[PDB]
Amino acid sequence: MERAMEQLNRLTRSLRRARTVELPEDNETAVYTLMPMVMADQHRSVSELLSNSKFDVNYAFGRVKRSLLHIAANCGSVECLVLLLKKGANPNYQDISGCTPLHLAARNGQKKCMSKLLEYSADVNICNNEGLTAIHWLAVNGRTELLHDLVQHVSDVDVEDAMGQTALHVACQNGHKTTVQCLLDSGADINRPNVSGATPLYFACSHGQRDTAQILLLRGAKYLPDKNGVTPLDLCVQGGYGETCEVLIQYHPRLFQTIIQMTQNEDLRENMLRQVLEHLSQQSESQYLKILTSLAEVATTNGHKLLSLSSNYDAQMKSLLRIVRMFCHVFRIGPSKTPRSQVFKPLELLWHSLDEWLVLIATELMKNKRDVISMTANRLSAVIQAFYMCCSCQMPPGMTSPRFIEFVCKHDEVLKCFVNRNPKIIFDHFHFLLECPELMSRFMHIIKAQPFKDRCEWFYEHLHSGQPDSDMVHRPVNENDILLVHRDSIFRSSCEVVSKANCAKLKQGIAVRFHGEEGMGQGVVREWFDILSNEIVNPDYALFTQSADGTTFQPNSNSYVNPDHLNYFRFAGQILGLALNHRQLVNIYFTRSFYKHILGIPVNYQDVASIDPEYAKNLQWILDNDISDLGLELTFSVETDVFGAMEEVPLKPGGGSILVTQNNKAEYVQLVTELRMTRAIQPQINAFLQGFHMFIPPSLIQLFDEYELELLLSGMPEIDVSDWIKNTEYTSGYEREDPVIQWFWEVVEDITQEERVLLLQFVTGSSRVPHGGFANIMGGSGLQNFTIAAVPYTPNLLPTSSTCINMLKLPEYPSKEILKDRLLVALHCG
Amino acid sequence: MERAMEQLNRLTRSLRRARTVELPEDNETAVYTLMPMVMADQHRSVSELLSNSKFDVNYAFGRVKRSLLHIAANCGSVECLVLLLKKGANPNYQDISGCTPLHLAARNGQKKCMSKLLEYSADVNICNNEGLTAIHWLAVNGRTELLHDLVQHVSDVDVEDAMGQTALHVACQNGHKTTVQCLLDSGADINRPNVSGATPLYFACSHGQRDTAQILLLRGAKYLPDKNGVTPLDLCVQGGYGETCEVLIQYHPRLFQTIIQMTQNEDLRENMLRQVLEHLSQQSESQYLKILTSLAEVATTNGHKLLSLSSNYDAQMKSLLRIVRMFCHVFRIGPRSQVFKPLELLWHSLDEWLVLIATELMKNKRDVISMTANRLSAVIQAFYMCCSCQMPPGMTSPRFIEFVCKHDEVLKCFVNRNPKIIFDHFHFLLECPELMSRFMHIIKAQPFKDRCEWFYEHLHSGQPDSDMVHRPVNENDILLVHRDSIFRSSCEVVSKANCAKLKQGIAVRFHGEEGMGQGVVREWFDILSNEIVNPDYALFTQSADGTTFQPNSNSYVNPDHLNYFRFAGQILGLALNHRQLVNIYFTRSFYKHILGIPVNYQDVASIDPEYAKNLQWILDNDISDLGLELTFSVETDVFGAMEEVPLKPGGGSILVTQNNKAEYVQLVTELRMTRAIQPQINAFLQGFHMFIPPSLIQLFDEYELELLLSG
């Protein structure tokens, strides 16, 4: 009967069990209606479809040109592909890249899908566009069980892809233990080379698969390099895998003597070759001592090479610097007692070579003294440099080695020759000198033999050296870098933010923002320094007080009233250090005493005269004439009143009744002045210097003078000598027509700008510059310009000045040249 | 040499005592050399030096031309004060700023310094250039003991400075209760007026010191405004001090009424007024209902005039919405319901004949009408919060539903005139399912271009600190994603992020590059859309046409599918939030699911036309046309397993309803289209509607949302 009944029951079974009626024969529409029942492996639906269909099962569709079987492999379905294959499906179909349905099933790791798919006469040698066959895809995810049955149906396990890598190479790259074992026992070559002639271990060490390599070596792997001749261990240290090196070194003990001799190479990173031999050193104490031992003769034989002055040195000293820096570091990290002395026996032969090397050179040079000298000095200086680091590693840091100090002293004169030749060597080769104040003082006079502004850029270079990315430009200003302060309590607010901040980031960059202000810039920080300069001179905080000079300041003795005075002192030191770090000037001038305290050199009688000239005048008399014949009451002790309380201060414990004579009056004067200057401010200056030292190391700043340090803080103000002369009064013995002042005014004119400020510091100590000219100079809060007094001339008599009244006493001289040298040595004696 | 023996003795004793005795005749040298002893209070040393000196103790020095007596007073020394004053120092000397040593002693709060200065006949009325005496500094420092000692020697306790302040006012400014107690005990004026009319109560309300106000009211203070008529209560309410208000409530029983009847002012903030009201609400339950009663007549008398008269539109309804929103807030902050019932009747009765008025509009229906509707809409809108105050939230009471449904025609007429009246006055329809849908089709008649612009305006509305004009790129807002694993990295960073951070701004960065800009965001959303459409992640599948995609059915095809489905909703919500098009393209049934309306058979035809073709054919026929076979139970196959579902719950159908196929076809389509993808739809929508609430997003149909997202 007509198809009305036939379509009625087909739609009846459609509404009853989601059954089909008919399938269109057009390829693109037929396939694009048959995903959903294959999504869940609906075997009942697809079985009914095969009953009534004329659609080929080998169709290409989509951007990848997959077949129906590829959906089954991807989805993990099993029943649909069984009936799809029964329809006549080809399991050797390929996608755009040649993807066999075996590969897609392998991509998802479907054990069941590949089992029946292979059972239907599927070729196993089909490869993708990149040459990856079936087993290559299984090696990416490393399913060993699916490898086991597949390789049983695969003729050759050494099939190479387009890149030339077998299944073993990629399996070793992924570091799967069971997969590489299964491939090797299936008949694969353990030492199969690639297109680049690389053993499978070449890729193993590149990725640092320690356990995979260990089986390969234990199974009979052969140590061979690549076609370029580079050993796998060379890439293994260049891969940074210490554990893989440990396996190689124990399997091949000859590599131990081989790894230590490539340390001379420079291409490999120093910090990355650090990790490889630290790991072997810490494996055991026996390995710890031999690695320290092995590097000892390596340094010994490398040092012998440096004794050949005719050979190249730039690469040699870098290798010597590399080894010795690493040599002491391994000793510092410690083993995994007496073995420290045991390893010193490999070290003692190193010293015996080193001490012998220089003494024959040093004796040769001193005989010559009694430019090839320049290069020879540089070479041994690195030896002298290497002479220190392994000296400093003998004991924990904190002191200089006495054995180092003894031997340096006995050749100090020879060492004094090298610093005489080139002052630039004291920083990089004599960096240890900064750690030894005792030797620093002896070489201080040599360093001061060149009072140049070159030292200014030296100090900035030394401070910025060793800091990563040490550039003061193009630094992003992050939110965390910005410090918020409030102008109502700017002095206290600035203390809080810097206390909670990080020193390293503040040294690298500066970012301070005032509350309620959005306009940011470097000028704001400059104004922040300026207002801070005006805050420290404000007596409200009671931290600094005006001197008798009237323009300089000294620490306040009664600063203990403020509870946070110590916190303010360290805060002041921190901000001044940051200003010096970032090359920011300060418009505040301080007394000579403050600069002497922070520099560390002791003060003298002239310092007392800067604040109390009357008392120093009495002290000047006592130090000139004899005191034993006078029979005064000098008993090395004084009775004083401090803070309204009576106190007796004996200058010597138990020596408070010993009469002071001419011989011992030098220390009597020094002690009483030191006690009066420093006792009332000793904790205050100690808190200030440590606050300044948290950002400026004491060793680096020690190379300056009191006048040099003030000049850096005060910048380089201009001096108009012609204007200064024309508006300066002249009285007190010397007339305006007296040639002596003309000589003095000519001397200040013809000297260098560096000498001009030095003369100004010597006569007054202040770098003041009035607005609009040099008229209207304030002396002791009163109107007073610079004046010169007249005194009789005696041999070895130098002029002296008092800044309180801007007066200087100048001995009578008959010529300008006599006046100049007397003034020049006076500047040198400042 | 000159006086050898005399100078030798001087030399030895000077060094033995560690300091010099003789002092040079230079004034500048003399003052600086004397500093190290004056701050040290070395009375014996300065006495010895002064006996051997011929200087003047009244010499002026320093920036302010201060004296030696000034330095000692600044450091707090006492004994050195006596020696200087006994040697001829003038205690009444003042600096260039008018500062006498009395002020410095007052500044340092030294009892010994001021007592000895008074003993040496020092004037107590000395003032600086600003006309401020030492009493001002003592009051600032809060030295009650020093004030009592000084006031015993001060004739005029009520002295006024340049500003007109007195010790009573300045102490109140500092908030010292002990100082004002001594001043009040001294007999000073309690209602002293300032040049602007300020009183001690004027500063009491400005600072809101509860203890000081209580003491001031205890002593018998008077209530009066200033010269400008500013009531002291105005400063107290503008200072937000509920503690002082409650104290003044006890003293003045009329204060609570006055502040409540002054609530209609517009100069004071919204949350600022709520703070004082709740402070005086939680003091006691009797006061809690008392103020609730008091605000009840204010609300009903404010709506009574809005019922009757017409005035400035913005001024009137804003005042009503101002008071009613705070009236319900204080109730929500906290037998309470029973006492609220009569308070309900004050505005419910007022609303009752508003219902009578709205009934007259239907009689009128069966432009001054528009303006009456605006006033009526606001009070009807305000009546919702009144009904919301009757019960806990989360539900819509049938009371206003009954009133609105019976009076919907005039509401429909004005909504047609002004569709935007729904957004503000009918903002309450977002929680009433019965009323959103009935007004849903009415607002659908508006053009799409007008509707979308309104939606964007209210998408960004109601968000505090919502700035869309060059928001700074914060460190936290920066999201780092790797190019190779952009899908995984973006999901991870979004999981650890917050909705509020990405709601306003957005920042995307990649490793090895510093790419930033709107294009980076556009390509980030584009690459995510391209990675989700194709089945590479096995999360979406192609449709019949091949250019459209639908979600994968089986759950856990991808292990992290639930995370991605939530993640997909998150990113698409952000794309809509920032108002840019996306290249995503889903099926029509996909938009039906995200909207809410049931999926028709046409969407089913988009996957398998033959299955829907049979369903639509039988829908147009009878039960058994041409001998058709029908069943009341259906069967579906999942994962090769055979399962049966008897259509309607409780068993198969037993009676013929709507050709016995209408609802049956609807049931089989819905069950087949959503039961297999129900859990994944919920995960997607949850991530999508958390950025845009469903009420504010369901106002568009499928076609309107498609155009705005795709373009």
Author numbering:
A (entry chain A): 1 to 336, 350 to 383, 443 to 902
B (entry chain B): 1 to 334, 352 to 383, 443 to 787
Pull verbatim passages from the article behind this deposition.
Here, we report a cryogenic electron microscopy (cryo-EM) structure of the full-length human HECT HACE1, along with solution-based conformational analyses by small-angle X-ray scattering and hydrogen–deuterium exchange mass spectrometry. Structure-based functional analyses in vitro and in cells reveal that the activity of HACE1 is stringently regulated by dimerization-induced autoinhibition. By contrast, HECTs form a thioester-linked intermediate with Ub before transferring it to a substrate. A RHO-family GTPase, RAC1 cycles between inactive, GDP-bound and active, GTP-bound forms, allowing for spatiotemporal regulation of its interactions and functions.
We determined a cryo-EM structure of the HACE1 dimer at 4.7 Å resolution, using AlphaFold2 (AF2)-based predictions as a starting point for model building. Each subunit of the dimer consists of a C-terminal HECT domain, flanked by an α-helical ‘middle domain’ (MID), seven ankyrin repeats (ANKs) and an N-terminal α-helix (‘N-helix’; residues 1–21). The MID and ANKs form a concave platform, above which the HECT domain leans peripherally. The subunits are arranged in a closed, head-to-tail fashion, giving rise to a ring made up of two sets of ANKs, MIDs and small wings of the HECT N-lobes (for HECT domain architecture). The large wings of the N-lobes are juxtaposed on the inside of the ring, giving rise to a yin–yang-like overall arrangement. The catalytic C-lobes protrude above the platforms, with one adopting an inverted-T conformation (molecule A). In the cryo-EM structure, dimerization is largely mediated by contacts of the N-helix of one subunit with the small wing of the HECT N-lobe of the other, with minor contributions from the N-terminal ANK. The structure of HACE1 FL provides a rationale for how dimerization inhibits the two-step catalytic cycle: at the subunit interface, the N-helix engages intermolecularly with a region of the HECT N-lobe that coincides with the conserved E2 binding site. Although this site, including a key phenylalanine (Phe715), is conserved in HACE1, it is occluded in the dimer. The binding mode is incompatible with the HACE1 dimer, highlighting another layer of autoinhibition.
